[PDB]
């Protein structure tokens, strides 16, 4: 209260008053009774315990239900002291429910901002808040978590500040679904990033950048309209002083297949259909393509018009993106004329050579155009397209492909094309996001999606589930070399494995040599292979040698499960091999690389696969992310309905155990909670077992707590010791207290009684001292009622005076 | 049963002059001949009865003495020992050191209670404005009756 | 039990009453030393009667012992006022201000049979205001020792 003011409009988001707290954690509690569970309909919904089954349990619910449940699926309820924890973490009671209900009471609260250990869980307003409030955005500044309530510039802020301190590199990763709002965040981090430590004694280059890679690696997705295919990294390099140097952005997946095939109801990158909308007629001439999309097959395989999108407007704002990001004409035109060569490649045509089994070009009028485009060779082209020229043993042996084999090799070109466009467009982008000042630092704020599991997984799946798999483990490492600096920093006494090595198994058959990706990336060599041929070899390979791998429970198809962290996911194989070659003919590819068009010339100078790519591509980011202090942000969505304030359960559970909060929880709840202090151990103990007397008082403040857990029906397990402290797991030291109750009431009762028998022993000393006086007092008076009445008396009376 | 004065002090605590004290006076009257009896082993044997200690103590000093004598037996617990260590556990920071409002609420608050009048009634200028209180000296100054 | 509290103040206080009642000297009041008593204090309207019953109260002459053990015997119960003033200081304690109406009407009616319910209602009566207020008990001693106006 006192102290926010900073806020002050926004501190209602942010914390709530002195006495709403007090008024909460503050109120009656029953701990035995009181009660999480399972539930049909709702998830898990709260209850109180009215009977016990011996291993069933009734429960009463809130809203009026009696169900009788398992033994476990009851779950305990934190005591009220718990209401509505900035840090989830420090619950007492790390459950699956108790993390649902917190996020959820913070929420109908409107608190947004909640921290879940590292976490910073996000959930979408869905309305408007003071949050990302200019007031903020100070108050934030050079605060340290614990100095302020959960918010987003606590990370953003702490980064810097540590940036500085301790002279390491950041990095901020921020991830969940479609709906989840990460744009937003980033861009905020972004902002405050500039704010905060800004030199222009940008801010559109850094904003132009996004419709220029939404034009590529963006389009309508049969849930979204302008789906994200994109991710990004942005490296903003700070000085040496502090200020602002340098950025750097990175896109991935904007999703290869896109660029060759669709589905029924989406349809491919932006771009194209932006290009082909007409309002630049040059480009279509330029270009030479039509305005029809039905021209071009890689294109138009599933929808072609959105009516929630101005094909026309995009365009512009395309190019003048562009421009503004500061690209070359020419390079604006390498885009352009690019672009289209891609489209025409998806138009060219073959056949068999008559009695032979080879592939012959069936005609020389859109390679010519192709050709034309990148500034190649209509011949020389398909020569090597046909005739691919390979070099097996020390020399160059001549290769011939069938009509299937080109068909594959050219989308297989088609797709490694566009990538690299599209990641030498980042590099531009982050170029002149390049200064001459010089860079000792940089803060990575990577925006990527977070592993989504469909009933329909495709390979683009796979591509990003894998991403996450790796940031996890990234994670759960992180996680695993800060803990064991705590009990070495205590000196409590606690060893453990890496957790990180637990995903170790997936990532391999993934990644590793004879893994999915290898024989995948093999098999696009074998000019006449199927993604039945694939899937055998995959199978062969992996079947019953490896347990990750699986194949499919019949309940779309599936060819393959893997089991990834977060659960089974089911993979359909089935467009692979193509959306994978866009295996690279070499033959072509030099082509490129002496192209007029030295843009083209200069995407494939560090030579091939689609996913030979990603995987480059995603080690050099995990490895950029390695040089960095890891910072976590996990965004959230509420409900799929749009409504502030309002959460569908099942929905957000599934969101945590994907996100990494569950399993941070996880490893939170395995080591030693609770430590006590030796001295602090005594004190409030020693009267446990007391008398573990004559070797436990002669004594030390460490030994002796040894010593006294000597006694106890308790488990010798449960803690553990070490240099400055005990170490204890959950609900021990509550166990501890509990003997220690009723310790009290002995000791206590016992005292009680005494006082009690000693207050009245008083009482009798002043009732019989009393004794006479009242007598006195008694007697006296009844005199005086008697003689008042008489003469002689009043005589005396009236008389008494003229005495002496 | 036996002893002579016990018999007189019955009387100073009539209250009506009848030589008859009621059932709930019982409890009290034991406490000063002699020694201690705690408040749920009073409510235990005879107490728990109302009309048995109506007609067994609610009485004459025919069921008074045999209830006192009762009491008698278990009073062994007068043992000081554990009676001054029990507190220094509350407050031990060197001395026999205490404060004030931990020993005033959890006198009042827990397992017997004690009216709040009563415990500061035992606080009587044992506890000056220091806020510390010294626990050695209460067990004796408790004990002194 | 009348010669037994009864200290030589008390007694003197009384023999200078009998001399100022004692008109002729003599020795012995009679109906005539009462009457201008009396008179001398202002009562003329006195009638042979309440004359005669005052007398009556004794078997002899009304002689300094006479008079002494008729008015000792009527205050067989009766303390001088600093005595009285000690019981009430002892229920008072702590000291200087007087007690409470409850906290003497149950210490009468305690301990004891009976100072009964009609006696202490007809107590906080004729003992006042006083007894409402700090149950005056310095004025209580001095109307008791004093009279009832004073």
């Known amino acids: 209260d006192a102290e926010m003011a900073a806020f002050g409009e926004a501190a209602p988001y942010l914390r709530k008053s002195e006495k709403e707290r007090i008024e909460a954690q503050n109120k009656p509690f029953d701990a035995k009774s009181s009660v999480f569970v399972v539930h049909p309909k709702e998830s898990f919904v709260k209850g109180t315990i009215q009977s016990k089954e011996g291993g069933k349990v009734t429960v009463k619910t809130e809203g009026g239900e009696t169900l009788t449940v398992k033994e476990d699926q009851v779950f305990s309820m934190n005591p009220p002291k718990y209401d509505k924890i900035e840090d989830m973490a420090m619950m007492t009671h790390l459950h699956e429910p108790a993390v649902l209900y917190n996020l959820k009471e913070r929420y109908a609260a409107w608190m947004i901002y909640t921290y879940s250990g590292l976490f910073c869980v996000t959930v979408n307003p869905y309305k408007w808040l003071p949050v990302y409030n200019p007031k903020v ?17 606590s990370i953003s802020d702490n980064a810097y500040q540590f940036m500085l301190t301790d002279r390491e590199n950041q990095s901020i990763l921020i991830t969940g679904e479609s709906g989840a709002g990460k744009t937003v965040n980033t861009k905020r981090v972004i902002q405050y990033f500039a704010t905060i430590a800004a030199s222009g004694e940008l801010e559109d280059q850094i904003i132009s950048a996004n419709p220029l890679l939404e034009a590529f690696g963006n ?9 994200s295919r994109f991710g990004k990294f942005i490296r903003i390099h700070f000085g040496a002083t502090g200020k602002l140097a340098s950025a750097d952005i990175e896109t991935y997946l904007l999703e290869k297949s896109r660029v060759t095939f669709q589905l029924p109801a989406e349809r491919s990158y932006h771009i194209f259909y932006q290009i082909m909308s007409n309002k630049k007629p040059e480009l279509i001439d330029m270009l030479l393509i039509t305005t029809n999309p039905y021209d071009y097959h890689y294109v138009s395989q599933g929808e072609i018009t959105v009516p929630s999108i101005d094909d026309q407007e995009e365009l512009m704002a ?10 070359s004409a020419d390079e604006k035109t390498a885009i352009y004329k690019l672009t289209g060569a891609v489209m025409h490649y998806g138009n060219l045509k073959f056949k068999q050579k008559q009695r032979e089994e080879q592939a012959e070009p069936d005609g020389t009028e859109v390679a010519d155009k192709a050709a034309y485009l990148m500034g190649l060779n209509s011949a020389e082209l398909l020569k090597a397209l046909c005739y691919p020229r390979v070099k097996v043993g020390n020399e160059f042996v001549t290769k011939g492909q069938t009509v299937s084999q080109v068909h594959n090799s050219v989308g297989a070109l088609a797709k490694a094309v566009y990538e690299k466009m599209f990641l030498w467009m980042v590099i531009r982008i982050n170029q002149q996001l390049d200064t001459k000042q010089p860079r000792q630092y940089f803060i990575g704020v990577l925006d990527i999606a977070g592993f989504e599991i469909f009933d329909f997984n495709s390979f683009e799946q796979l591509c990003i589930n894998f991403t996450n798999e790796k940031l996890q483990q990234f994670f759960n490492h992180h996680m695993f070399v800060l803990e064991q600096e705590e ?3 205590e000196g409590i006494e606690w060893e453990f494995i890496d957790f990180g090595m637990d995903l170790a198994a997936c990532i391999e058959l993934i990644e590793k040599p004879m893994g999915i990706f290898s024989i995948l990336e093999e098999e696009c060599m074998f000019p006449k292979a199927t993604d039945t041929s694939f899937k055998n070899k995959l199978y062969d390979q992996h079947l019953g040698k490896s347990n990750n791998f699986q194949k499919p429970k019949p309940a779309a198809e599936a060819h393959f499960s893997l089991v990834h962290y977060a659960g089974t996911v089911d993979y359909n194989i089935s467009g692979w091999l193509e959306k994978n070659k866009d295996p690279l003919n070499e033959t072509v590819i030099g082509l490129y690389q002496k192209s007029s068009v030295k843009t083209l010339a200069l995407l494939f100078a560090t030579y091939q696969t689609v996913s030979a790519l990603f995987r480059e591509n995603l080690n050099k980011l995990m490895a950029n992310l390695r040089s960095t202090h890891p910072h976590f942000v996990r965004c959230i969505i509420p409900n799929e309905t749009k409504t502030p304030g309002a959460m569908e359960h099942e929905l957000v559970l599934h969101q945590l155990r994907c996100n990494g909060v569950l399993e941070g929880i996880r490893i939170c709840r395995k080591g030693f909670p609770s430590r006590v202090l030796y001295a602090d151990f005594k004190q409030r103990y020693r009267v446990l077992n007391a008398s573990a007397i004559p070797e436990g008082q002669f004594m030390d403040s460490k030994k002796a707590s ?27 030291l509550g166990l501890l207290e509990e003997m220690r109750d009723d310790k009290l ?6 005292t009680q009684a005494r006082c009690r028998g000693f207050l009245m022993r008083v009482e009798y000393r002043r009732m019989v001292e009393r004794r006479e006086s009242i007598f006195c007092i008694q007697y006296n008076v009844r005199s005086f009622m008697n003689v008042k009445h008489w003469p002689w008396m009043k005589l005396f009376f009236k008389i008494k005076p003229l005495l002496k | 049963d036996e002893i002579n004065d016990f018999k007189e002090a019955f009387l100073l605590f009539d209250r009506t002059g009848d030589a008859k004290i009621t059932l709930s006076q019982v409890g009290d009257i034991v406490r000063a001949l002699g020694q201690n009896p705690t408040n749920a082993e009073i409510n235990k044997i005879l107490g728990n009865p109302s009309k048995e200690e109506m007609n067994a103590k609610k009485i004459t000093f025919e069921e008074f003495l045999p209830m006192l004598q009762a009491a008698a037996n278990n009073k062994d617990q007068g043992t000081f020992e554990d009676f001054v260590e029990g507190l220094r556990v509350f407050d031990k920071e060197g001395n026999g050191t205490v404060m004030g409002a931990e020993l005033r609420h959890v006198l009042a608050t827990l397992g017997e209670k004690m009216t709040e009048e009563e415990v500061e009634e035992l606080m009587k200028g044992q506890e000056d404005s220091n806020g510390c209180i010294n626990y050695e000296a209460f067990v004796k100054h408790i004990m002194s009756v | 039990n009348v010669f037994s509290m009864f200290d030589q103040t008390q007694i003197q206080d009384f023999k200078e009453a009998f001399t100022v009642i004692d008109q002729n000297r003599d020795g012995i009041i009679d109906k005539d030393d009462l009457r201008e008593t009396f008179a001398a204090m202002g009562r003329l309207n006195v009638k042979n009667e309440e004359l005669d019953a005052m007398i009556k109260e004794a078997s002899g002459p009304i002689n300094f012992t006479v008079f002494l053990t008729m008015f000792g015997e009527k205050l067989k119960g009766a303390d001088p006022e ?33 100072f009964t319910p009609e006696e202490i209602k007809n107590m906080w009566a004729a003992f006042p205001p006083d007894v409402a207020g700090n149950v005056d008990y310095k004025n209580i001693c001095y109307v008791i020792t004093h009279g009832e106006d004073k």
């Not at chain 1, 857990?709 to 797991?729: C, E, P």
């Not at chain 3, 600093?82 to 409850?102: H, R, T, W």
């Not at chain 3, 003497?104 to 009976?114: A, F, H, P, S, Y």
Request: glycine fraction near 8%; charged fraction near 30%.
């Open chain 1, 137 to 153: 955005v100070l108050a934030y500044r050079g605060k340290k978590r614990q100095e302020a309530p959960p918010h987003i510039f």
């Open chain 1, 219 to 227: 389009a309508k997705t049969v849930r979204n309209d302008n789906s």
């Open chain 1, 318 to 327: 395309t190019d003048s993106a562009i421009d503004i990001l500061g690209f």
């Open chain 1, 487 to 489: 009990y070495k920093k």
């Open chain 1, 706 to 732: 040894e010593k006294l857990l000597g006694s106890i029906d308790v488990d010798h397990t449960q803690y553990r010791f070490g240099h400055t402290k005990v170490f204890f797991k959950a609900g021990l």
């Open chain 1, 745 to 750: 009431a002995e000791i206590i009762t016992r």
């Open chain 3, 82 to 114: 600093d005595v009285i003033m000690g019981a009430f200081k002892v229920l008072d304690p702590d000291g200087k201000g007087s007690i409470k109406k409850s906290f003497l009407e149950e210490l009468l009616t305690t301990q004891c049979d009976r």
